[PDB]
Every structure is written in structure tokens, then in C-alpha cells.
Amino acid sequence: SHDLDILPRFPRAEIVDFRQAPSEERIYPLGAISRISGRLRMEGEVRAEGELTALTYRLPPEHSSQEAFAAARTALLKADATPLFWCERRDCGSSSLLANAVFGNAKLYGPDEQQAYLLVRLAAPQENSLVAVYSITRGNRRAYLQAEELKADAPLAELLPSPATLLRLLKANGELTLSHVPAEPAGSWLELLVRTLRLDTGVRVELSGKHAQEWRDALRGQGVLNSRMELGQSEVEGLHLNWLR
């Protein structure tokens, strides 16, 4: 039928599967997916039930799955969605599990080394919406991209990415926004950013957003060197981070 209001246009891409459901359950992994003893295992997950819109695109032969995935990733982060998990190739675990057990679409099954997966939480006013993107290039040399929105029927918990996800995405995408942080820097989100900046001590960032000054100093007081953090100008409600190469 129609695209998700938040995604880009993949030039000449065709919708090959469209699904909607007013109350479907999704269990989106927050880490690699595998089977142990035949039972499904996720290294962290988010379960939510709500209105599901799932779009399956087949890309034109001229354009790679990885290109469309990067465009989708760039667009969701520029919409200031908080990233929750991002992974490429074998880091995602099994394509068969993602295709079948998570998205329930066997067309998405391909070589593990050709996949990519992203999960984000949309910014308020859509803060109980999750958007998931999955890309694959298959042996038939065709390229597909799955994009799904789950509007949860109940408010989502406090959902945070790992420090590894934050660092990796800051370098793969160059920037990202954390749009579900408290206005006063503290708690889980301050802890996450502190642990992210101790995992790579050389990386430098520019902070912007309505309370970016407050964040930088909370971080200085948790031990981050002030030389590592510059300040930008944005009115976005969240904390925006920009990789200073």
C-alpha cells in the first residue's frame, strides 16, 4: 500500500510484501540471535504488542542492500530516533532466525554475511513506536529491505542501547540522537554515555540539543576529559552526538 511516514524513497524499489495488523506481538532482538538446543536465544530483546505495519522492498539490480540500509539508517537517525541496536553480517547472528522467527518472512533469508539489522525507538510524540529495518542480499543476487513500525499498545520501558552499539553507530553514521534521555543528566543514560566514552577513550564528540551544556558537564564530572567534547547548536529536545574525526 503505502510507505512508513519516516523512511526514505529507495529509487525504483518495489513493495513485494505489505502487512498490517492492529495488535501483533513483536520480539525484536537487542543482540545476536541464535538457537541453543533448538530453543530461540537473543542477547537481549524488546517485546511489544501493538499496531504493526511491515513493508518488504525488492531493490532494483543497480543498488545494493547495504546502500539502501545505510540510507534507511541515516534517515531514521536524522529523524532523531534513539538507536537501540545495530549490527551487520554475522554480528546479527542467524539470518534464518531474523527472517523467520522475528519478521516471519522467509523471503528475507539469505547468507548471514550479507545481512544488516537496525532497531530504533521514535522520538516523542511517537515515543512508544519502534521501527525495525533488516536488509539482505540473496544468492539469487536480488536485494531486499524490510521496514516495520510497531506502535506499542502500552508505554515502552526505558530502552537503552549498549555502549558498543553507540560507538559503532557513531562511526558508521557519523552522528545520532538520544531522544529519550532525562532533561537533568543522571541515571541509566548518563551511565551509558560514561561507559561508552571509557570504552574508546580517543573518540571525540560534539554535543548539541536543548540541554547539551548540562550533559557535557555531567560527563566531565564523571571523568570524561573536557577536550573530548565540543558544543554545537541545536534546539532538538534530545542529546545529539556528532563524531569529531
Author numbering: 24 to 268
The article reads:
The fold of these domains could not be predicted even using state-of-the-art prediction methods, and similarity searches revealed only a very distant homology to known structures, namely to Mog1p/PsbP-like and OmpA-like proteins for the N- and C-terminal domains, respectively.
The protein was heterologously expressed in E. coli without its periplasmatic localization signal (Δ18PA1624). The data collected from the native crystal were not further used for refinement and structure analysis as the diffraction data obtained from the SeMet crystals were of higher quality. The asymmetric unit of the orthorhombic crystal form studied here contained two chains of Δ18PA1624, which superpose with a Cα r.m.s.d. of 0.5 Å, which is only slightly higher than the coordinate error. PISA analysis indicates that the protein is monomeric, which is in line with observations made during the course of purification by size-exclusion chromatography. Except for a handful of flexible residues at the N-terminus, both chains could be traced with confidence. The two domains interact through a relatively small hydrophobic interface covering about 600 Å2. The larger domain is dominated by a six-stranded antiparallel β-sheet that is covered by one α-helix on the face that also harbors the N-terminus and by a mixed α/β structure on the other. Towards this, it is interesting to note that the interior of the C-terminal domain of the protein is not optimally packed, leaving a cavity lined by hydrophobic residues unoccupied. Therefore, we suggest that PA1624 has a novel, yet-to-be-named architectural domain arrangement.
